[PDB]
Design a protein around this ligand. Structure first.
Ligand SMILES: [Mg+2]
Ligand SMILES: [Mg+2]
Ligand SMILES: [Mg+2]
Ligand SMILES: [Zn+2]
Ligand SMILES: [Zn+2]
Lengths: 99, 108, 156, 42, 162, 38, 177, 38, 39, 174
RNA sequence: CCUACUUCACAAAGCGCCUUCCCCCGUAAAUGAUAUCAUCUCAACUUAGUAUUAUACCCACACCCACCCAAGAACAGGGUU
């Protein structure tokens, strides 16, 4: 019964471990975890927590590139909040439209 | 000018968006440690074994370091050496010893 | 609209000034020309890729293995072009998709090796004092892929 | 005054020997980032 | 300003009133329509207990406060300044505004317990020995509720009781 | 359980407590505080 | 990289010594950073089985600063086993008796309550003054920044800054102060 | 001193001051009127 | 998380209603398309 | 050195011979214990920074015993010092202007008549003693019906606690 | 603790003898603003106001068959010159 009930706890604990490792790497880059996840999904790059933690451990240059992307989209969102747009709605905004 | 992260550690990123708009390009060459951020290697050359009478008395002196302690002080010494507590360095029973994998799996 | 300097007059974060968009567009053109020249002259080696496949995302390099938990209707030995490559990366440059990269940039080849079941996984229920005791044994099918090559093309 | 390799270790001597190994791999074109073998048919 | 001079001169004391020079306002306030000095410089809700450049304009040379009729503040921005200078005296700031005393300081008291955002007087609080249950804990008050209306940037309000 | 009318303020159901928490009187906020304006 | 295997794993799983100043910081904001870097949570190679702990060296712990009236209300409480042995003292009395105790109790509280807590506290080195021993000063990397800003009392105000700030009001010239 | 939850001055010369965290009523003419907030 | 995804008309859970889900996962090496996925 | 007012000097190690009565000029009778200083010698000196940073210490040895019945390191210590081995060794906290050379003799005229001393020794061991002789408990009465309970401790705790406290008085070695 | 007394006697005991050292906080008072007087101060501050950052014990890593012991249930401890 413990072996059957352990599968849900395994999935939950693995995602909490990924959240801890991504928080560690982003806080090495001076970024918080919510800023990284939110502003990464706002550039339409859909990387899940598993490959983000694996990029954090094994490919730290690609993680620095991702942290720079998330910070730039964060800054664009802040300037858009001060200006309501007008002109450019940023550059690393402007989502690609699919039909 | 504006860079989103400091560009002194690990890497130097430039972020680029394609003219099509459909792929983000990141260029990141590694940064080396330049020469003036390194101290030179210390060269320890300590030699005080030479007394003028013999020459192989120093080779005799080479094996003069032996010590015996009982379990208590040895555990205290290992604890203050490796910055752990005392509970590691005690043994275990036969039951905990003989159910441990001696041929564990090896990834990579 | 003047406020003298106090602790709460100005926001605590430093004031960021994002660049001019025209010079930034020219700079993006220069960087993508650099990276396209690095691709076309062959200045990479052992590039990896993040690939979406069978509802997961596999951080994948060349010559490795991935094991997925379903059949594929593919006889072993057959090669596969895994589409939906949503990040490719060598050393010194990476390319991100939005969300997926183009079909002409990246091309990931993969070969199927082995089609097996799993070890028997036990499913058991229990409720105390209710005489409730079910039990199953389930072996789900599996497939092993071997990622041969991750090529890249200068169409950028 | 230009870096060619860098190697870790537990003492200074084994770190220097490992740095020599890293430079000696990088000179010979045999790094862990090299092009993997091109199994294909021409 | 004005000061009094006393000269004991051969069993005859002279008590003189003399006017020294005084400063005035900086020559262009950004909002001349405002009534307070705080409203006249758009400083409403913009200061904390750190701003001792702002607070040392409204205090006597021994640390005491100045009245509303002299300074011209309103009732609600006076009590914010009045409480902020009490939190800056206790936090080690304003060291030149110590109280005058002939020789009493020489028995140095208990050492530099460094503090900040101190709300009550340090010698008038009993220790929280019992702390209550989980649902009504006895909290330590930090900061002052007069400064609840300060501008907040943290997207979580000032935790005043913890 | 207690009656509908009691002596001791009768702790509410938590859904009703949330309802009475979310429907409180919110006074109107002037743009510039009226004394700070001439 | 390319980093032969045992040097590579040694480089990845090594220990790092950190220095953190006291000197007008709250003990809880020091305890947060010390707890994160004692557990090893600041590394992306973190796992609770991996023992990826680091050393934290805190100096100037005698010069910490409690916010509010916590020097007279916050009570640290213990018990000897014997009857009549309930002891409760304020933060001021405990800080005077042992200058290093408040930060140690905060860090010990924030750590997880498993069996790694005593070893992770063995990797904690706490010193009350500017003096740190020579081996511990020879091990150090990376003085971590301080959380609090140390709000800079008035005599340190560099007279050009007083010339910057405007005089907000005109006093009556016939007033005494 | 007598403990009272609501203090009031019983004569002209009582004076209300706040010492050691409480509100006290002192009086120098009639010391009966000394009160102490509980 | 995404509720920003609804403002772009994109169905907040990115694993349903997109090109990330509805495109075919694989194809043969000589170019032939796959049989359609069962979901 | 001469005596300063904040000073503490060394003591001795004596051997308790016996007791004796002793009369004063008003007629009262006091009892004295005769402590004899048999063979006393300062053994070694530890400076102020080498023990706890508070007060310097001096070691003082007791009466002479045989070399044939001590450990090897102790015999090495007395052979380096130059004395026969002593039975007991006590450590005296002194201030460092009262330090004496190790190997000196300490006598009984170290103390003077009219002074106050504090003597400390191992008390007489009475073995595993029951609770009435040890803690001075009362027992139960003797003959009014009591069944096998004449010297028992009785109740040792209350009923709510479910244990006994660590400071509990029970039989034990006394 | 056994030198007198007593139960007793190469011991143990009291009915017998010796020694026994730091506070504790509720208020009572100066200066002085907010409120140019005044005001003991959950204003900055000064006294009665803190005994303690207390000192005494105890802290020698392995001769050990055996004997004795004021040490002791066994074990442990002290002496054997
Ligand atoms: Mg009886
Ligand atoms: Mg019977
Ligand atoms: Mg009987
Ligand atoms: Zn106003
Ligand atoms: Zn009255």
């Amino acid at each position: 019964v413990k072996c059957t009930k352990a599968r849900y706890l395994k999935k939950k604990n693995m995602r909490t471990l990924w959240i801890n490792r991504i928080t560690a790497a982003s806080q090495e880059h001076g970024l918080k975890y919510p800023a990284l996840i939110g502003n990464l999904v706002k550039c339409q790059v859909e990387l899940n927590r598993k490959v983000l933690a694996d990029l954090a451990i094994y490919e730290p240059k690609t993680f620095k590139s991702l942290a720079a992307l998330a910070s730039r989209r964060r800054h664009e969102g802040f300037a858009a909040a001060l200006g309501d747009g007008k002109e450019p709605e940023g550059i690393f905004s402007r989502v690609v439209q699919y039909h | 000018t504006y860079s989103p992260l400091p560009d002194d550690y690990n890497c130097n990123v430039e972020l680029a968006l394609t003219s099509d708009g459909r792929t983000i390009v990141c260029y990141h060459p590694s940064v080396d440690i330049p020469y003036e951020h390194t101290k030179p290697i210390p060269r320890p050359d300590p030699v005080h074994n030479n007394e003028e009478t013999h020459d192989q008395v120093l080779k005799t002196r080479l094996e003069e370091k032996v010590e015996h302690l009982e379990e208590g002080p040895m555990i205290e010494q290992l604890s203050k050496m490796f910055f752990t507590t005392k509970h590691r360095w005690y043994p275990h029973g036969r039951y905990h010893r003989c159910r441990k994998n001696l041929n564990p799996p090896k990834d990579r | 609209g003047y406020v003298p300097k106090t602790s709460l007059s100005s926001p605590p974060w430093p004031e960021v000034v994002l660049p001019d968009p025209v010079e930034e567009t020219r700079h993006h053109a220069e960087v993508v020309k650099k990276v396209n020249e690095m691709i076309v002259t062959g200045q990479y080696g052992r590039l990896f890729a993040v690939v979406h496949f069978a509802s997961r995302q596999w951080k994948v390099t060349s010559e490795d293995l991935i094991l997925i938990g379903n059949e594929l209707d593919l006889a072993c030995g057959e090669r596969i072009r895994l589409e939906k490559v949503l990040l490719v990366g060598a050393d010194n440059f990476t390319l991100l998709g939005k969300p997926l990269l183009g079909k002409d940039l990246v091309r990931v080849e993969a070969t199927v090796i082995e089609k097996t079941e799993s070890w028997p996984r036990i499913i058991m229920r229990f409720r105390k004092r209710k005489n409730f005791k079910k039990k199953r044994i389930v072996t789900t099918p599996q497939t092993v892929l071997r990622i041969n090559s991750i090529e890249i093309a200068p169409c950028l | 005054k230009k870096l060619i390799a860098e190697g870790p270790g537990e003492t200074v001597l084994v770190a220097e020997e490992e740095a020599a190994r890293v430079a000696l791999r990088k000179l010979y074109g045999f790094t862990e980032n090299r092009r993997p073998w091109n199994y294909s048919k021409p | 300003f004005r000061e009094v001079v006393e000269t004991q001169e051969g069993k005859t004391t002279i008590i003189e009133g003399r006017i020294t020079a005084t400063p005035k306002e900086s020559p262009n306030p950004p909002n001349p329509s405002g009534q307070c000095p705080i409203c006249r410089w758009n400083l409403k809700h913009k200061y904390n207990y750190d701003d001792v450049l702002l607070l040392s304009q409204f205090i006597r040379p021994h640390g005491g406060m100045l009245p509303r009729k002299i300074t011209g503040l309103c009732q609600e921005e006076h009590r914010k300044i009045e409480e902020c200078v009490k939190m800056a005296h206790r936090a080690g700031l304003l060291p030149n505004h110590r109280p005058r005393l002939p020789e009493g300081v020489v028995p140095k008291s208990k050492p530099q317990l460094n503090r900040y955002l101190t709300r009550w007087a340090p010698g008038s609080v009993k220790p929280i020995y019992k702390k209550g249950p989980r649902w009504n804990r006895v909290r330590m008050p930090v900061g002052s509720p007069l400064l609840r209306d300060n501008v907040c940037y943290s997207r979580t309000p000032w935790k005043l009781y913890h | 359980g207690s009656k509908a009318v009691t002596r001791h303020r009768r702790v509410m159901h938590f859904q009703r407590q949330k309802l009475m928490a979310v429907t409180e009187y919110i006074p109107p906020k002037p743009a510039i505080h009226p004394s700070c304006l001439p | 990289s390319s980093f032969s295997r045992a040097p590579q794993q040694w480089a990845t799983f090594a220990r790092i010594w950190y220095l953190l100043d006291g000197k007008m910081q709250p003990p809880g904001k020091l305890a947060a950073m010390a707890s994160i870097r004692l557990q090893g949570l600041h590394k992306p190679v973190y796992h609770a089985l991996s023992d990826c702990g680091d050393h934290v060296v805190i100096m100037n712990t005698r010069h910490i600063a409690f916010s509010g009236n916590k020097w007279e209300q916050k009570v640290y409480s213990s018990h000897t086993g014997y009857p009549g042995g309930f002891r409760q003292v304020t933060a001021a009395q405990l800080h005077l008796r042992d200058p290093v105790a408040i930060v140690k109790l905060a860090i010990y509280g924030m750590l997880p309550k498993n069996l790694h807590r005593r070893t992770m506290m063995e990797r904690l080195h706490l010193f009350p003054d500017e003096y740190i021993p020579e081996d511990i000063l020879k091990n150090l990397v990376e003085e971590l920044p301080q959380p609090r800003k140390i709000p800079k009392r008035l005599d340190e105000y560099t007279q050009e800054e007083i010339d910057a700030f405007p005089r907000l009001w005109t006093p009556p010239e016939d007033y005494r102060l | 001193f007598k403990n009272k939850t609501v203090l009031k001055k019983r004569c002209k010369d009582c004076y209300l001051v706040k010492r050691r965290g409480r509100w006290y009523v002192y009086c120098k003419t009639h010391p009966r009127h000394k009160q102490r907030q509980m | 998380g995404g509720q920003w995804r609804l403002q772009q008309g994109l169905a907040a859970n990115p694993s349903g209603y997109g090109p990330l889900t509805e495109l075919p996962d694989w194809s043969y090496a000589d170019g032939r398309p796959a049989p359609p996925m069962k979901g | 050195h001469p005596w300063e007012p904040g000073s503490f000097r060394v003591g001795l190690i004596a051997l308790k011979l016996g007791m004796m009565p002793l009369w004063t000029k008003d007629g009262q009778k006091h009892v004295v214990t005769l402590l004899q200083v048999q063979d006393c010698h300062v053994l070694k000196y530890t400076s102020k920074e080498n023990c706890n940073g508070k007060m310097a210490t001096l070691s003082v040895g007791g009466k002479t015993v045989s070399r044939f019945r001590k450990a090897t390191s102790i015999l090495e210590f007395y052979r380096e010092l130059g004395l026969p081995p002593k039975q007991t060794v006590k450590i005296f906290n002194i201030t460092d202007n009262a330090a004496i050379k190790p190997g000196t003799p300490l006598y009984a005229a170290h103390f003077r008549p009219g002074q106050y001393v504090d003597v400390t020794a191992k008390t007489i061991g009475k073995g595993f003693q029951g609770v009435m002789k040890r803690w001075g408990f009362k027992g139960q009465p003797a003959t009014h019906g009591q069944t096998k309970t004449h010297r028992r401790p009785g109740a040792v705790a209350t009923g709510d606690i479910g244990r006994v406290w660590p400071g509990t008085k029970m039989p034990g070695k006394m």
